[PDB]
Amino acid sequence: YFKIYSKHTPINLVRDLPQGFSALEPLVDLPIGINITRFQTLLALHRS
Amino acid sequence: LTGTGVLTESNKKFLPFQQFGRDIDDTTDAVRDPQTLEILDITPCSFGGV
Ligand SMILES: *[C@@H]1O[C@H](CO)[C@@H](O)[C@H](O)[C@H]1NC(C)=O
Numbered sequence: 617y618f619k620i621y622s623k624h625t626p627i628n629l630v631r632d633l634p635q636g637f638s639a640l641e642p643l644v645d646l647p648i649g650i651n652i653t654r655f656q657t658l659l660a661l662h663r664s
Numbered sequence: 665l666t667g668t669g670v671l672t673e674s675n676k677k678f679l680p681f682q683q684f685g686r687d688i689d690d691t692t693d694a695v696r697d698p699q700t701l702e703i704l705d706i707t708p709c710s711f712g713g714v
Contacts, residue, residue: 642681 618652620644667692667706674705 622643627634665684674694676685685694685705694705 641679 618646618648620646665692665695669706669708671704672707674703676703676705678703 620643621640623638623640625634625638676694678685678694678696683696684692685703687693691708692706694703696703
């Protein structure tokens, strides 16, 4: 089971992480049953 | 999940992920019923010394 816990926080700090407490609610309990050892995030380009 | 108790209305603001509830002593105190999604409080049936 691949568990995704998520939280959205309104912040106004410019550069680093804010200092505070915010509990992450469980979002998706996912039934995959596969081996995971490496990951990579996906970004979006801007074309002009 | 099996048990015995009286099912009553509750005022506990359950979060959407949350299904059942546990009291201070960790006894289950409320459950969310399937099909209707309502939250029912579970209070143990009366017992005492005769
Ligand atoms: C059946 O259960 C689902 C969730 O378990 C609920 O969304 C749905 O409303 C229920 N349907 C009926 C007819 O009770």
